[PDB]
Each structure stands twice: as C-alpha cells, then as structure tokens.
C-alpha cells in the first residue's frame, strides 16, 4: 500500500544513488512489500530549496544547504568546522553516539531523521603549494559553506561549477575547494598542480522523512527499518574511502603532486582553526551549535 | 545480405530476434578477425554489438522491478561492456583508413584530436556515429568516477564532427544521440539544456514522421528534467499514435520504442510531482 | 537436409531444441523472401513457425502457475501471432500454385470457397493441413469476438478437404486436429461431439501405436468435457506406456507429449469433480 | 491450504473468463497464497441446474437461470424488466447502493454473494425494421427469460442456438433476441438486416460461494477480498462497453443498419413496458420483487 | 576453424556464449551423422556436448538457491544426459579406429578391458580423456544405485591410460579430472585421499600458472573434505589473483572458473565448521 | 534470521540427501524463509563421534553409532533385534505409536528428535547357501552392531569396507552383512553367489536438533514443521522399498540366487533369535530397552 516519495540529491551513477535503492529494496522486503521508496531528482523539482516547500513529496535527502534551511536551530554546519572531524572513524563515532542531538532540531521542524552520511571530504586543489595554512589562505580559491571559510581568512571567490576552468586558465583563481570525486570525474585535475590529501572536514547529508508519512509505517517495522538505514551509512563510509583512494591515485598518476600534512602541521592548523571558531560564533551564532561543538571535542 | 537483415529489422517478435542474434554476432565477429582490414565488416559487427546491447541487454533490464536492482546492475554492466566492444570494432575501421587515428583521437590533446577528425570525410560519418554512440551509451552505464573525461569528450567530438559532414544523416540520428547526451550532462561536462534543445531542433528538421523515437527522446530527455508532464504525455501519445504495420522500414525498432513509451506512460507518476 | 532435421526431431532435450531453432526459422524465412515462388520453401517455413509456436511458445505457457496468467496471456498472444504467420507462409505456396486462391478461399462466398478447394489435388494436402491447422491453432488462442467466423470456417473447410483427398495422411494427423476443433466448438459454430467422435474414430484407423498424441487428444478433448475421469486416466496411461527409445521417428514430439500427459495426470483434480 | 471449486458459466476466451482469474490471483496473493480459485465448466458437469446439486464444489457463477433456481424468493429477474436499467452507469448504482436486498435472498439459500455483473445487453436482431415497439412485438423473434417477453406481447419461438440460421433462411423467424458479442462472434449477423443499439436491460450474473467454504477463509481477509470482487465488477462493465461498441461497428461495417431509438421513442417504450409489469405480477409474482422493483425506480 | 573457436574461448560474456552454442552443437552433430567415420568430428561434437553440460547446464544450476533444488535436480539430470551423449560421441571415434573397442572396454572383464586399452597410442589420448571425463562427470550427477560400477571403472581406466601415454597432456588436464574423482570416491570404489593427492602433485608439475582451475580443484576437492579453511581460502585467493586479460588463451574458462571461486568464498561458512 | 547446521550422515547421491533438502526447503517456506538447514558431512568433521562434541553445530543426523553414543540409556539398538521389526509397515507403526519412548532418552541428553527413519534392511550376502540359521551362523561373515551378532552365535570378522573383496577372493570370508544398495552400488555382488531377500531388521536413524537451537524457532512453527519431518520419514520408507526391489532385481539379473525364507523358516529363526535376546540382556543390559522391547512385541 504505502509508497514514499524521496526527493534525492544523489548523483547519477553515484554510490549514494545505488545505496538508496539497496535500502529501498531492503526495506520493501522487510515490510513484505507494503512500503517502499520512489526517488525524485532535486534539480528537476527546482533545487534543494524548492524541494523544501514540497514537504506531495514526503521525505528528502539533503545537504546542509537544505538541512539547515528548515532547522536554522540546527547544529549541522557544526560538523564541518575544519579539523573538527578529521577521519572516517571519528565521523562514525559522532553520528552514532551523538544521534539524538543531531536529530532533535529536525523534530522541531517536524521530521524524523532516517540516517546521516557523508558526501565527501573537502580538499584544496591548487596551482601553487603552501608552507602554512596562512599562505594557503592568501590564495584565491573558488567554491553557504563558503561564507564561513571567508571568515577564517580564506580568500574565496563564489563561482559556478562551469567557470572554474576558464578562471584557472585566466589566472583569476589559484585553485578551488572540492571533493576528490569531483576533481577527478570532471577532468578539472588537468588544470591544477596540487591536491591536499589530508582530510579537513566532512560534507554531511541529510536523509529526512516527514513525521506524518513515517506514520503510515506500522510500529512493528520501524526498528529493523532504521537499522537498515544505519547499515547503509556504514557501507558508504567504507566504499567512500576506497573510492577516494582510487580518485587520489588517478589524480596522482595524472601528474598532480599530492600534498600530505604531518601531525606537526595538522596540530598547527587545528589551533589556527579553533581561533576562527570564536570569530564565527560572533559573526553568526546560528551556524554553530556550541554545545554540540564541545560535546564532539569531548568525544575525542 | 539485404533480405537477411530484413527478417530481423522488420520483425515484430522481440524474443525471436533475441534468441537468434547472438550467433549472428559471433559469426560476424569471427569473420572480422579473419579480415581485420575489411572496413565494412569492422563497422558491421560493431554496429551489431551496440544495437544488441541496447535492445536485448540494457532495455530489458530497465523493465526490472526496483528490488531486482542487483540483477539490473549486472545487466547494466554487461551492456556497458558490449557497447565498448562494439565501439572498438567500429573504430578499428577508422584505424584501417587512417592509421594512427586511435592514438590521436584519444591523445587528450585537443589539437591532435581535432586535426585527425578534420581529415575525416562524408564516407566516415556512419563510422563516427557508431563509435561516438557506442562510447556515449557506455558512459551512461558507467559508475561515476570510472569514466575517463577525455574519452567521453573524444566520443562527443566524433558525433559533432559527423553532424558537420552530414547533418541530415540517417534521418537525423546523430542529433538524437547528441540530444540525450547534452541534456544528461552538466554545463561543466560539455552538456546543457540549451545545447540539448538546439540538437533537438535539428533532429526535428531531418527526422521521419513514422519514427517514434524522437517523440520519446523529447518526453524523457527534455520533459522529465524540466518537469513538464504535459509535454511528456503529449509526446508519448504521438509516439504511440504511429502504426507499425504502416511504417516502411524498421518495424522492430518501432515496436521496441512503443514498448518503452507504454512503460513510460504507466510510470508517469514516478517521473513527475 | 534429412540428417539435419534428424538432430531436431530425434532430440530428447527440449531446451536445446528451443535455443537452436529461432535462427533456423530466421534463415528459412530469409530464404523464402528470396524465393517467394518456391513452394516447398514457403510451406517449410510456415510449418516450422507453427510447430515452434506450439512446442516452444504455447506449451511452455500452459505450464505457468495460475497467477502468472498475465505472462501466460502475453505468451498466448505471442503464439497466436506465430501461428498466423506460419499459416500465411504455407498458404502462399497454395497462392503460388493457384493464383487467386487466397481471394477465393477468404471470399466469404461458400461456392467460391468450395470451387477453389475443388481444384486442389493430393499434392496440396500437406499444405492444406498446415494452413488449416495454423489458423485453427490461432483461433483457439484468440479473444472471443476477435476472430472472423469466415476465416475459421475457411480453415476448417481446408482440413475437411485434405481428409477427402488423402484420409490416411500422415498417420491420421488431419483428424487429430479436426477432433480437437469439433469438440471445442458449439453445434452452432460448425462443431459438436458427434462430429468430434467421428473424426476420432477415423484417427484411430490411421494412427500409429507408438504415437502418444491420440491418447492424449482422447483424454482432454473428449473425456474431460464429458467428465469421464476413467477414460481420462486410462488414456494417459496408454500415452505414458510408450517408450521414446523404442519409437522409429519423432522422439522429440513423443517426449513433448508425455511431458503433457504427466502434467495432465498431476492435475486430474482440476478437470474432474 | 484452502482451494475453492467454482463451477463457472464464463465463455472460453471471454473477458469474464479472464477476469475470474485476475480475481483468483488477486485473492491468492492477498491471502499470501493460502486461498485460491479453481474453475470448472458448467456445460461439463451437466449444466446450470446439475451444478446446483453439487453445492464437492463450493461456489458458482450463475446466470438468472440457476441464480433463481436456488432462490425462487429472489428478486433477480426483476433487474431485466425492460428499460428498467437502461445504461451501464445505472446498473452500477443498482448493484452498489442496492447490494443487501439483492443479496439477502441468497443467504436464505445459504450462500454469500461475492459479486454481481453483466453478461450483456439484450438487443433485437431483425430482418425487417419497426416503427413502434408494438410492430416489433408482431415479429416472430427467437430466444426462462423468454416466457416473460411472451407476456408483454412479444411473439416468441423457443429454439436451440443452432436452428437460428436455418429458421431465418426458412422465413420461420424474422429475427432473434441476443447480445452483440453473440451475434457478431457467431457470424449470425450475416442473416439479419437490423440491430437495435439502444439498450433494453442487463443480463445479470451471478457469483456465489457456499457459506461453509467461505468459513475456511480467515476473518482477516474477507474485506479486501470482497473489495477485489467489486473491483472486478467495475472493470468488466467498462470493458464490456468497449467490446460492445466494437461489436456494433463490426456489425455495421458488415452492412447491418443499426437501429437507434430517440428519447421520445424510449419513453414511449418505457410506458408500454411498465403496463406489462402489472400483467406479469399477476401471471407470476415470484419472478418479480415488487419492493426491489420500486426501490430501483426510486433510485433513478 | 581456428578463428571461429576463438570468438568463443576468448569471450568474456557467458550469456552470449550460452545463447549461441546450442545451434553450433546441432550442426556439428548433424555433420557427424553424415560422417560417422570421421574421427575428428566424432570427438569434436562429443567434446562440445561435455563442455556445454558443464558450463551452461550443471554450473548455472549449482548457483541455484537451496529451495530451487527441484529445478536444480532437473538440471543435474539434464547435464548428466548431455555428458553421456558427448561421451558416446567421443567413444565412437575410438570405435572407428579400433572396431570392437566398445564391446571390450565395457565387457566387465578386466583383462579384455586392459588389452584393448593396451593397443591405444598417443594419438588417442585426447579421445580417452574426453570419454573418461564425460562418464565421470555423468557419474557425479547420477543417483546412488543408478550407476554401473563397471562403467565407472572403465572410464577411470581410460583416464589412467591417458596419463600413461601422455602424462603432461593439455597442461595436466587429465590429472585434474582424476584428482576430483579419487577424492570423491571411497577407498573401496577405487578412490582415496592418497591417490587424490598423488594425482594433484602431478597436476602441479604440468599445469599453467595462468590457470585458476587447479587452485579451485585444490580448494574444494581437497581442502573442504579435509576441513582446511586456510588452504581453502589461500587457494581461492590464488585463483582470483590471475588477470583474465593477461592470459594467452581460454579467457572464457578463466572467467567461468573465477565466477566459481568468488561463489565458493562467499559460502565458505557452509563448507567449514 | 535463523540458520541451522546439521552434520549429516547421508550419502552423496542418496535419497536421504535429497529428502533432507526437500525438508529444509519445506521448512524454510513454512517459516517464511526465516529458518533453514545447512548440511555438513560427518566424514569431513571427523566421523560420527567427533560430530558429537560439536553439539557450533546445532543438530545432527545419526545412526545408532552416535545415537547411542549420547544416550547409553537409549533403547535404540533394541529396534535392530533380529526379526523383531520384519517389514516396512511394522516399522512405521513402531516409529509412530511409540515415538515418546524412543524420544525421551534424548531429552535426557538435551535434544529434541525431529524424526526417525531407516538406512536399510540388513541382509546376508554369501558365497554358499544354508539350510538353517545355525548353518549360516557357522559361516564367517564380515561387518558396534557386529559385537551383538557375535553373541547370537554369528561368526563375525570385523573388517574395513575395502578389504571385503580381497578377503572374499582369499576365502577368508564366506560373505558379509550389509544392505542391498551397498552390495549393488559397490559391485560387491560380483563376489557373492547368494543374497537374502527376507528382511531381518532395520538400521535406524537418527535426526536430532539441539534443545537450545530448537528455541530460536518460534512456538508457532514447531507443529507443521515437525509434521514435515514425519512426511519425509514416510516418503523414504516408500522410496526405499522401490529402490530395494530394484537393487534386488539387478543383483538377480546379475546371476545371484536370491534367498527367500518361508513363513515356516521365518518362525524358526524368530525363536532362535528370541533365545539369544535373553543372552544379550546378560552380556549387556545397556544395549537393549527391555520395556521398549516388550512394548513392541505387544504392538504386533
């Protein structure tokens, strides 16, 4: 009987796109075929924001663009504080032990969180190298999330995904901020000599279903169902590691020097980043949950 | 032979065609390996592999239930591989005419690429189309990150070359393929909706009134992503209006295409709202 | 070739036959389109299409579970179409001998029909049988109201003609088909049980002791509708008693037929009481 | 576990035959495969009456021949009063809003009614045309149901389905009473110059299952089950319209003049028919339910 | 033809091979019945039947879910029958060279058996292998009590003969088959683990480093029954380590074999502990 | 969720091996796929005894070798008292009406008995014939179960399955004790001129599942489940008759004289056997359940 429309932000041939089906079929069978998921594309319905007003469609997969669009009270963008969550394991612990705090803001918008996961680890892809974070901050790097980095002292240009190549070839950009799969799969690696391999922070997503539609689901099924969404989260975080190493080696075989930070440097960057954290808190409180912030540092 | 291709193309029974073809490819392939230099053969076997992947590998899989998706993924992978194989076969006819072709076109050097394509004539158009088409079909079944952006670009440049030599070719078929490609790629991948519509306009100059494909292409490469159900619905009605008995040639492909339109209409709910 | 038809007819593996035949029909068909005038070819391809619809299209579908009935209906429709195609192929051999034949026999004028059949000789009997048979097979898979009563009548008149020219033909095979037809049609459609039994009596004069079919035909065209389980059970035992290794020719068709008898016996509960 | 034998009166390749399976598979799956329907032919077991004494076999599909064979207290033949129910929509309303009254007589014979539906709309197929109902009534037309028409002033001959052709060719019949699918599919249209397209009344059927066998079915399933039998009823009434227009156009392409009554004429016939209704009530009360009768006129 | 066998053996698509082969066997068989005396033909059709039963009949069935076991049993029975047929075909090439061969080898008289095998030369080895192999394959699919112990013994004696004439034959392939046989038979049936290991040692002298089979054979004919998971796991890793693109010949059989290793690894839980 | 490991003593291509799957699939479907059976070979895990200590693996199929290995308190070997149970029907009655007494000893070892069945009927396969049981007892016949026969006055040699042929060819054995399928399928019939067709006693097996693992199975399912294991038992006992007649006719076609005892002789053997029964009771009490013994004689 029950069929759910999830507007999906997952890419065409991506592992997310595949994982979302593996879940939909994993659920269907668990409900005995009664309940399932039909995916709709967010570009098609007018973008992440236009998707919001359609909650017609009961459920969504969101990046922090829309995830913090319906819960300004959301901590969220807190997780992408630089060097806060610096590796795949640390991210697991944080989505696991910390679920309820991440969740609650969204029941304040009237949604149940199905599961959390990662779109990728931000990296810098640059024409020149850098001795320190500061020097890197001098470079004009192109990329919501961007306005934050600007604060930390990152010179940033806000540009469409297209104009990147022209702007590089023009010397109007020294590089850009992105994930490995993007810079590989687009061929944009061709225009860049250096890629940071040291993870900065996760880009978190994002699956929500409407409180009402989550009602049509019989009490019985909720548990193993939601344990299926967490199975998924874990599979991805693994596969994503594999895919990122692949994308790195392909970037490297292609002649790009791969930048690696030493623990020395990593602590040096952590500190310079923690100082900016104070600064953001002033220049916007709503984009950081300070108790979520600290509870994460506690956790490791 | 002409009357032999007829028992296939003018056929209305998809199972029959599907059970008989594999051996036919195996033969044409064995022949081709005898005569690597024979260009019409190279192209013929490549064209067959491609058309077969589409109709009998990819297409049937698309009709699988959304929980059979693992079976559906194998099939997509199977079809991706057949597309590549058929594309290398066709390309090897170009390599026969223009030794060093492959190495240029896949150089990654835009100039070398364009130079080598510049030396192509109206005689190569069918070959360009099939190779370009075979790679683009493959790319569409290829896991994100597994493609090589230069390979795709090369393939697309071959199609655009074809258009330049012989715009009206095969009742517009090169535009059809191009339209699907531009609409499914970002303005950053060499695609876009503007390009896509432009290619479609050309397609409608050259296309036959008995061909369902261009209606279908309009419905699902344009109307869906632009969320136009109306356009989507009317186009499919146009596609389904055509009588297969009344078409001059390619009854099979009409029948195949209408099977798809029927399906698309059944599922309109999943593409809109 | 004679030893080529042997590897098929004397075969015991149904899958093998089913996977190999489609291409063989495609070839015989392509040949036929080269030589529209060659009569033995016209008939040969038509006969193949018919025999294939029966064994590899209709038959397998009959063994589908009663909830697969949608899949079973497609298959019936598929088979109905193959029967018609094979029947037109065979009929076109008659049209080659007797130009204007088709137009007469399908006139709807009983006199024109009989006149044109009156000019048929013992040489045409196999052709009459296959065409008559192909249409009658189709009619049995045809949605009520979709047939044309004149077409059926014509087909049946062809079979009755055959009987007249060559009663003993092919160990009685024309009677077999006729028996199934008369028993399944109302006394108002040109059928009946009296006719049916009469045709069966003839069949038993000419039929082989190694042929399972006539027992099976007796069980399910006669015994079921007359609700005779005994007759039904004993006949199938007779059919199943025959050793396929011990038969002179047509091992495959024996094996096919026994597969059906086995099935009929398994389900006796659904036909009786 | 449970398997039901329904003796079926549905024709070989008919939509009914197909619809009865679509239901049997629709039920089976709904019960999770436990309960299903195996169909048996009523000609084979000795006709509609012989089928009755077998209620061995628990269930049946019946025309009013057998339907009024086990419930003489049945209204039933009431629905085939001429011009009473004159179109497909009106028949729906009557099988829907009126279910319980149609049903009850059959729980008095110990059966539950699964669903009702139509075998077709009676029409006249005639060698000559007619200015009025009266003139038509003069013609010797061939067809239980027949004895009623005789009352209304219809000259009727009771003849087997065979002898129709001979009797026409002999001039011993001016035409016959039937449904479009019959007159088309038999080729009997060849012998007739005129076919009434204006619907007279439905020929109703008829599916019953034994109270006992309906017990083996768990309480849980009955509802969606019986809502499946009503789904079926509706599909047919649609498909039957399509099939009848097809049969009409084929009859017409074949050169038969199609008779259409104007609303003027339709009311003229209604009246002449209502007068006969009084007459039948006297010449048999048991073949009309007078409160069912009137409740239908009420309804429209 | 050599380039024709190439499009099959060097193929990576199992469905394609499976859809095309049945007709190829049917042809080779029809040919063989024309020329019963042609020895290379007799052997060629027999070899094909055997290889086909294995890859496209038995193998796919082994991958059926444990509740599909009825379907799996039919398939095993199908394959058992194809193995026997292919074995009689090959043996009839021996009967052509050595009239009276069959009657001796199947005598049940050990002396007659050995005498007749004593008259075999290095020219017969391939024939001995295929016949021996075909029967042993059949026996493995044969319901307990349905075999004939003498027939098995004869078949095994043929393989042991082959080893004697040409130990290194086909990169050791006779030992491979022998190893599977000895390990699966009781010390009272002419088998054992001692024999089995001995045959395997020989196999490893002659076998190719690009062949996955001998690793797989080691895993599941030796490691399982001896309950060695380690050996089982390491061997399959070895089998899966081989690159199919890098092998000189028989890509298809490598691909087939790796499909099996993958499966074996997935199910290690069912063979150990 | 639940998957059971049953170490199986069933032969490679045997009917048991097939029947155990038919049951595993019969159960699976009945549980809706939740519970099933994965079979493991007892040779592979170190024999019937080594399998015992693995009860890791929860369940087993056992001959009286292991069946009486974990319940020395078991009656068991009681059923193979010669001429006690002399035909297939009598064995059914005894496994049916007598279930609880056969069972109980194994809940004293902590197992639930799934079902009982027969490996075959012991027969004598001999180079020379015999006028009486006594004369047969003189012959050196080769075969746990063996030590019992020795008592009755059977000269017995305990030999591996291999050395049988050599020992026959050597004249160090006059014959051997076995089942028809063994002597046929091995070709060992070649070495023997006489085969007793008259059944002596069943060789009983043997399926047990651990009390714990039988817990994971929901109360709901146990019944129809255990009625499936009894369905199996019955199928085999039938099929085994067929297979034994086949094996006999093949043995006979092969030139072996088939020995048949007359009822006269059968009673003569029964008596001589009952006398030995007293003797065993002394030379081991634990290998016979005397109340199970007598309760069987009662039963027929």
Swiss-Prot record, chains B, C, E:
This is Uncharacterized protein TP_0956. Transmembrane segments: none annotated. It comes from Treponema pallidum (strain Nichols). The chain holds residues 50 to 322 of 323 of the full protein.
């Amino acid at each position: 009987k029950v069929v759910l429309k999830i507007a999906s932000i997952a890419p065409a041939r991506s592992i997310w796109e595949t994982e979302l089906k593996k879940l939909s079929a994993e659920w269907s069978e668990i409900t005995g075929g009664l309940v399932s998921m039909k995916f709709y594309d967010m570009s098609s319905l007018g973008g992440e924001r236009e998707g919001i007003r359609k909650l017609p469609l009961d459920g969504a997969v969101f990046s922090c663009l829309g995830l913090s669009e319906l819960a300004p009270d959301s901590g969220i963008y807190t997780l992408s504080v630089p060097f806060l969550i610096q590796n795949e394991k640390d991210l697991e612990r944080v989505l696991h032990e910390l679920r309820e705090d991440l969740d609650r803001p969204f029941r304040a918008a009237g949604f149940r969180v199905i599961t959390w996961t990662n779109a990728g680890w931000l990296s810098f892809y640059t024409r020149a190298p850098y001795a320190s974070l500061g020097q890197l901050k001098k470079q004009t790097i192109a990329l919501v999330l961007g306005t934050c980095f600007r604060i930390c002292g990152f010179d940033i240009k806000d540009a469409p995904n297209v104009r990147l190549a022209p702007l590089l070839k023009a010397g109007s950009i020294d590089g850009f901020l992105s994930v490995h799969l993007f810079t590989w799969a687009t061929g944009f690696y061709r225009y860049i000599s250096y890629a940071l391999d040291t993870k900065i922070c996760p880009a978190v997503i994002g699956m929500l279903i409407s409180d009402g539609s989550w009602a049509r689901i019989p009490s019985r099924y909720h548990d193993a169902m939601l344990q299926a969404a967490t199975r998924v989260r874990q599979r991805l975080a693994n596969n994503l590691e594999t895919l990122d190493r692949e994308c790195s080696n392909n970037i490297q075989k292609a002649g790009v020097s791969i930048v690696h930070l030493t623990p020395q440097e990593i602590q040096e960057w952590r500190t310079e980043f923690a100082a900016d954290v104070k600064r953001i808190q002033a220049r916007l409180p709503g984009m950081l949950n300070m108790t979520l912030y600290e509870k994460i540092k506690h956790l490791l | 032979d002409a009357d032999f291709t007829r028992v296939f193309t003018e056929e209305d029974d998809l199972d029959l065609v599907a059970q008989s073809l594999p051996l036919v490819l195996k033969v044409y392939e064995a022949l081709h390996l005898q005569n690597p230099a024979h260009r019409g053969l190279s192209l013929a076997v490549g064209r067959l592999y491609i058309m077969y992947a589409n109709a009998f590998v990819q297409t049937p899989a698309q009709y699988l239930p959304e929980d059979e998706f693992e079976a559906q993924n194998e099939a997509y992978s199977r079809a991706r591989k057949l597309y590549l194989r058929g594309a290398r076969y066709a390309l090897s006819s170009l390599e026969t005419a223009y030794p060093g072709f492959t190495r240029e076109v896949f150089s990654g050097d835009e100039q070398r690429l364009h130079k080598v394509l510049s030396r192509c004539t109206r005689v190569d158009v069918g070959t360009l189309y099939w190779v370009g088409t075979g790679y683009v079909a493959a790319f569409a079944l290829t896991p994100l990150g597994s493609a090589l952006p230069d390979t795709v670009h090369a393939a697309v440049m071959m199609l655009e070359r074809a258009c330049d030599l012989w715009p009206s070719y095969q009742e517009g078929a090169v535009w059809n393929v191009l339209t699907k490609f531009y609409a499914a790629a970002p303005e950053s991948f060499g695609g876009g909706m503007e390009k896509a519509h432009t290619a479609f306009e050309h397609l409608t100059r050259y296309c036959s009134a008995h061909d369902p494909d261009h209606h279908i292409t309009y419905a699902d490469a344009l109307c869906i992503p632009l969320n136009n159900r109306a356009g989507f619905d009317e186009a499919l009605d146009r596609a389904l209006a055509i009588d297969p008995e009344s078409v001059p040639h390619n009854k099979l492909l009409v029948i195949l295409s209408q099977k798809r339109a029927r399906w698309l209409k059944a599922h309109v709910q999943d593409f809109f709202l």
